[PDB]
Structures are given as C-alpha cells and as structure tokens.
Amino acid sequence: GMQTKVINFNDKFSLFNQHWSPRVIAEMNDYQFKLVKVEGEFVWHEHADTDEVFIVMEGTLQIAFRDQNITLQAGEMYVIPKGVEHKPMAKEECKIMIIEPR
Amino acid sequence: GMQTKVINFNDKFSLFNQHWSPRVIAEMNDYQFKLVKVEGEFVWHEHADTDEVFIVMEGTLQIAFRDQNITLQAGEMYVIPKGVEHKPMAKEECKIMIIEPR
Ligand code: NI
Ligand code: NI
Numbered sequence A, B: 001g002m003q004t005k006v007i008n009f010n011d012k013f014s015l016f017n018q019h020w021s022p023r024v025i026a027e028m029n030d031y032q033f034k035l036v037k038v039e040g041e042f043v044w045h046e047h048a049d050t051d052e053v054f055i056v057m058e059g060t061l062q063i064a065f066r067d068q069n070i071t072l073q074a075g076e077m078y079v080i081p082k083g084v085e086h087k088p089m090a091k092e093e094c095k096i097m098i099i100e101p102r
Helices: A009-014 B009-014
Strands: A023-028 A031-041 A052-058 A060-064 A069-073 A076-080 A087-101 B023-028 B031-041 B052-058 B061-064 B069-072 B076-080 B087-101
Touching: A009 A023, A009 A031, A023 B052, A023 B076, A052 A060, A052 A069, A052 B023, A069 A076, A076 B023, B009 B023, B009 B031, B009 B052, B052 B061, B069 B076
Parallel strands: none
Antiparallel strands: A023 A031, A031 A087, A052 A076, A052 A087, A060 A069, A060 A087, B023 B031, B031 B087, B052 B076, B052 B087, B061 B069, B061 B087
C-alpha cells in the first residue's frame, strides 16, 4: 500500500547514528531529500550550480559565511544561494534535512 | 543582514489564517516552498508534469487516492508522483508545507 511510502522523519533518524553522512529519504523529480546528523565543524565549500536548502529538525545549527554567522533552530530553514561559500557547524548533535538536485 | 533570510515556520504560519491559499516562503532554483492552512476537503486533481511534496507541520492530513487513502501526521511527508490524482483532506485545521516547481 501507498501508506508504506509515508516518511516519518523521527523513524528515519533512528536508523543511523553516523555524522556528516546524508541518507536519501525521498525523491521529487530530479531532487533528493536527505537526512543528516551533524556535530562540530564542516569545511568551507560551495555549490556552484545550485541553491541548497537547510531545514533544522532538532538542535541548533550555525552556518558561517565570509562576514557573518547565522543560527538556525528546530523549525527553521535557510536557502544557501548558488556560489556562496559557507561552513555548517553545530555545538551539539543537530538533526537536519538537506534538499538539493541529484 | 543574512540572518534576516532565516525562515521560521511558526512565524510564517502566524501571518495568515486564510485556508487553501498557499504562501510562498522560499525559493530554491525554480522551486517554491509554500505554507498552507487546510480544513475540510479539496478536489480531485493531478499535476501532469511534476511530483509534489506534502510535509505536515501540525495536525493530521489525509490524502485520498482513487484506490486507497493515506494519513500524514506532524513530522511526516509524502511525494505525490506526477499524473497521480489525489484529494487532500483534513478533519481539523492542518498546517502543511508544499514543495514543487514554480
Ligand atoms: Ni553545502
Ligand atoms: Ni496537488
């Protein structure tokens, strides 16, 4: 049945504990919805050809930009415009969802 | 500055009470993230050329299909494949997010 394809975020987060390792949970056209557990600092990087979306599901995420840091709480999102250098970070474990093209 | 671009779902949902009237809260490439308040039944329809994502933020949503029904709670999502007829319904007010091409 179609109900089996209803995705529960909490159920999906329970399946892995590894950090900085996105899990694809759904596809929409040529885009993917990915769950990630993060802690500590990522690296400075950019996506030259696409905007990237961060939705915080649980915890507190920071994203460093060249002149400022932004803070995202649970129930908040941000669109990183294409070509913009950034470095995601989390003081404690943070549960996020990323949406971007395949 | 850039913190002004952080989107809080509760803050956006509090800006309107009108039902079945999606409000665009963000854009990712040629896609839109839209918030909607729904209650009662919609109509049977399809999107021939695109998948459509529903994410329930608060309440309970039912989506009727021609052969079966699914139920989504807060913290759950479903991808309606392109060309598939469906009719969203909510017994009580339900807060949702829809993601699809502009
Ligand atoms: Ni990135
Ligand atoms: Ni629809």
